């Protein structure tokens, strides 16, 4: 929309109050002109026709419960944009400020959120398994990171390359949650998953086996479901990333942690300079080792901890 930039106020999915960048032109729209070529949030109105209509509001205050998922999709897309810009100098997902579009209220009782090749899509959940999925900052950042991966490595969405794809999104989703300091942890989707149960999540990076995923290459899923286990075998890489950052002893192999900032830098370089569409876990190890070598030198602790962490999860 052509109009005047302004700032509105609203409440997110979890009842927190936040300010959001909006655009005024008769109505107030969820259009943030301050980032790149814009952040645009649409209402799918409980259907599956996308994108639906650009969110319009009459008084620039977004406190209705119907508004909450849009507040958070809009706001958290902005925080994710800021993370990539400020920490990795990457301007939007294509590296040239492409506009970021999201649609909320997609379908009815839809327990998922996804990047569809051109935009983010968020279900409202069924109220028991999930609450509106844009309330999870890691969920939002996980899905927008698929857009980054599509424009850089192009990891295909199946088997080991698909599991790397998934793990990269869980890694950057987590790092965005730490960057915003929004009650951070190494779990995925705990803020919106099962509202009646405390302390669980969809996946854990510090201990993937807590929810049934493998934490070692010998335990990998080798069947055909979930596109060859893209959301299951990502646990092996997630555990490795957790060890690189936090350190630990896993199956008797001790890893000295190098922190989240170095983890983000090493995986960001591997993703954008050495991974290809069909990379497997073994190639990811080489990419991460070379990336750390590039950045810190071949005899550094950082390279040592990358190799130790892949050793600990059985990936050579
Ligand atoms: Ca209003
Ligand atoms: Ca958290
Ligand atoms: Ca989390
Ligand atoms: Ca829960
Ligand atoms: Zn994903």
Curated annotation (Swiss-Prot):
It catalyses: Preferential cleavage: Xaa-|-Leu > Xaa-|-Phe. Keywords: Calcium, Hydrolase, Metal-binding, Metalloprotease, Protease, Secreted, Signal, Zinc, Zymogen. It is found in: Secreted. GO terms for biological process: proteolysis. Transmembrane segments: none annotated. Its EC number is 3.4.24.27. Zn(2+) binds at residues 142, 146, 166. Its cofactor is Ca(2+); Zn(2+). The active site is at residues 143, 231. Ca(2+) 3 binds at residues 177, 183, 185, 190. Ca(2+) 2 binds at residues 138, 177, 185, 187, 190. Binds 4 Ca(2+) ions per subunit. One of its GO terms (cellular component) is extracellular region. One of its GO terms (molecular function) is metalloendopeptidase activity. Thermostable. Belongs to the peptidase M4 family. Extracellular zinc metalloprotease. This is Thermolysin. The chain holds residues 233 to 548 of 548 of the full protein.
């Amino acid at each position: 929309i052509t109009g005047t930039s302004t700032v509105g106020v609203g409440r997110g999915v979890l009842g927190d109050q936040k300010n959001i960048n909006t655009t005024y032109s008769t109505y107030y729209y969820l259009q943030d002109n301050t980032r790149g070529d814009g952040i645009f949030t649409y209402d799918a109105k409980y259907r599956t026709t996308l994108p639906g209509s650009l969110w319009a509001d009459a008084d620039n205050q977004f406190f209705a419960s119907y508004d909450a998922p849009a507040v958070d999709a809009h706001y958290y897309a902005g925080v994710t944009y800021d993370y990539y810009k400020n920490v990795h100098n990457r301007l939007s997902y294509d590296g040239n400020n492409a506009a970021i579009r999201s649609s909320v209220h997609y379908s009815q009782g839809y327990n998922n959120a996804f990047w569809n090749g051109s935009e983010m899509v968020y279900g409202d959940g069924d109220g028991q398994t999930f609450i509106p999925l844009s309330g999870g900052i890691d969920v939002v950042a996980h899905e927008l990171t698929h857009a980054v991966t599509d424009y850089t490595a192009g990891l295909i969405y199946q088997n080991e390359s698909g599991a790397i794809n998934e793990a990269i999104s869980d890694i950057f989703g987590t790092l965005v949650e730490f960057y915003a300091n929004k009650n951070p942890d190494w779990e995925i989707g705990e803020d919106v998953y099962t509202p009646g149960i405390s302390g669980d999540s969809l996946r854990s990076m510090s201990d993937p086996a807590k929810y049934g995923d493998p934490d070692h290459y010998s335990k990998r899923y080798t069947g055909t479901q979930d596109n060859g286990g893209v959301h299951i075998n990502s646990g092996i890489i997630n555990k490795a990333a957790y060890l690189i950052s936090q350190g630990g002893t896993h199956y008797g192999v001790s890893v000295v942690g190098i922190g989240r900032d170095k983890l983000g830098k090493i995986f960001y370089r591997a993703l954008t300079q050495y991974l290809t569409p069909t990379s497997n876990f073994s190639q990811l190890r080489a990419a991460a080792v070379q990336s750390a070598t590039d950045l810190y030198g071949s005899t550094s602790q950082e390279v040592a901890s990358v190799k130790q962490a892949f050793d600990a999860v059985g990936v050579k």
